[PDB]
Design an enzyme around this catalytic site. Structure first.
Site, short mmCIF file in Angstrom:
data_model
loop_
_atom_site.label_atom_id
_atom_site.label_comp_id
_atom_site.label_asym_id
_atom_site.label_seq_id
_atom_site.Cartn_x
_atom_site.Cartn_y
_atom_site.Cartn_z
N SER A 10 26.45 -35.70 23.29
CA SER A 10 25.79 -36.53 22.28
C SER A 10 26.31 -37.97 22.40
O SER A 10 26.15 -38.59 23.45
CB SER A 10 26.00 -35.92 20.88
N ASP A 67 15.54 -30.98 21.34
CA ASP A 67 16.44 -32.03 20.88
C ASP A 67 15.65 -33.30 20.59
O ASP A 67 14.89 -33.76 21.47
CB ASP A 67 17.50 -32.28 21.96
N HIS A 76 19.97 -29.54 20.28
CA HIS A 76 21.15 -30.39 20.31
C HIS A 76 22.36 -29.62 19.82
O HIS A 76 22.27 -28.83 18.88
CB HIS A 76 20.91 -31.60 19.39
#
Ligand SMILES: CCCCCC(=O)Oc1ccc([N+](=O)[O-])cc1
Ligand SMILES: CCCCCC(=O)O
Length: 309
Positions: A159, A251, A281
């Site tokens: 991320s 995501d 995610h």
């Protein structure tokens, strides 16, 4: 409707049933605590390792806390993994990603150094990048306190940490450290601005990472949209190190990872692009609650071993 794995869907249903507040509706420390609890209660337990050691290195703002993970008490010179956690540069720490770090160390049989970089809103952009870069350069210098000699470094992160991975590789590409970046592994990274992407609109709600959270992180971190240290899709890709880009099909920032892998191919760079199908995610840290995500992580591990030789 897009494909979702049954164990992933059950996890999403549990989150929806909880019907909690948004990150912006919590206090900052409550938001941070909600993330500790999310990974704490969803991820597999830590592996047992020979070495799990807290240390620190000098940084431009002061000392940077680090955590060293090694399955071996002693080992010969080799590449060292330098890990940067996710959490939008606002939340997460050495504990939210601790179990994942022990898993990477155990499955790679390489040392992992995780970086406790400064967080926003207290420390806005580029504070996180400053600490990630400084810690990676420090590891690359084989300091005596690390007790392991580095022949190369392997930036890796999820991320925001995947953003930091690419930025670190670009900064070290421009001004080399004592050893090269031999491989980088940005995992569901933010590389291009997600605003306007199809994935952001398709997965804005209900898929763990939400558009609202992305906006909350962006307001706190304050990355400059013209600065390649904020959005490394803008950087020079012509000498990018060997790369594994891992994304998730559900995501909202999936298309940002697609964009980065396409830019590497466009520049003629070697890249493994893996898009995990039917998960969200954050799949690297929900490996107990969604058991099929352990296999997703293992695929990343296998690609890393192949790309390292
Ligand atoms: C509770 C979900 C929020 C944390 C999601 C996460 O696990 O890490 C992220 C890191 C960075 C970005 N970002 O760059 O927008 C989004 C998400
Ligand atoms: C532990 C998370 C806080 C960031 C560590 C630091 O500010 O240096």
């Amino acid at each position: 409707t897009p494909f979702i794995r049954p164990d992933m869907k059950a996890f999403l249903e549990a989150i929806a049933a909880m019907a909690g507040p948004t990150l912006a509706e919590m206090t900052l420390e409550e938001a941070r605590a909600s993330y500790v609890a999310l990974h704490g209660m969803a991820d597999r337990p830590a592996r047992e390792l020979a070495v799990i050691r807290n240390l620190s290195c000098p940084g431009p703002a002061g000392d940077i806390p680090l955590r060293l993970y090694d399955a071996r008490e002693s080992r010969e010179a080799g590449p060292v993994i330098t890990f940067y956690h996710g959490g939008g540069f606002v939340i997460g720490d050495l504990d939210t990603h601790h179990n994942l770090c022990t898993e990477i160390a155990a499955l790679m049989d390489l040392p992992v150094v995780a970086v406790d970089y400064r967080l926003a809103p207290e420390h806005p952009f580029p504070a996180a990048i400053e600490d990630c870069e400084a810690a990676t350069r420090w590891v690359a210098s084989s300091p005596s306190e690390l007790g392991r000699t580095a022949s190369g470094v392997i930036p890796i992160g999820d991320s925001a940490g995947g953003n930091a991975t690419i930025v670190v590789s670009q900064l070290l590409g421009a001004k080399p450290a004592d050893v090269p970046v031999v491989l980088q592994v940005p995992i569901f990274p933010l590389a291009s601005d997600a605003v306007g992407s199809a994935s952001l609109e398709a997965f804005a709600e209900g898929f763990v990472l939400t558009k609202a959270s992305i906006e909350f992180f962006d307001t706190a971190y304050k990355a400059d949209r013209a600065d390649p240290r904020g959005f490394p899709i803008l950087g020079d890709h012509t000498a990018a190190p060997p790369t594994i880009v891992a994304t998730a099909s559900l995501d909202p920032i999936r298309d940002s990872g697609r964009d980065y892998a396409k830019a590497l191919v466009e520049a003629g760079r070697d890249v493994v692009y893996l898009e995990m199908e039917g998960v969200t995610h954050g799949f690297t840290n929900i490996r107990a609650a969604v058991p099929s995500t352990q296999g997703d992580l293992e695929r990343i591990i296998a690609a890393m071993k192949m790309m390292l030789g």
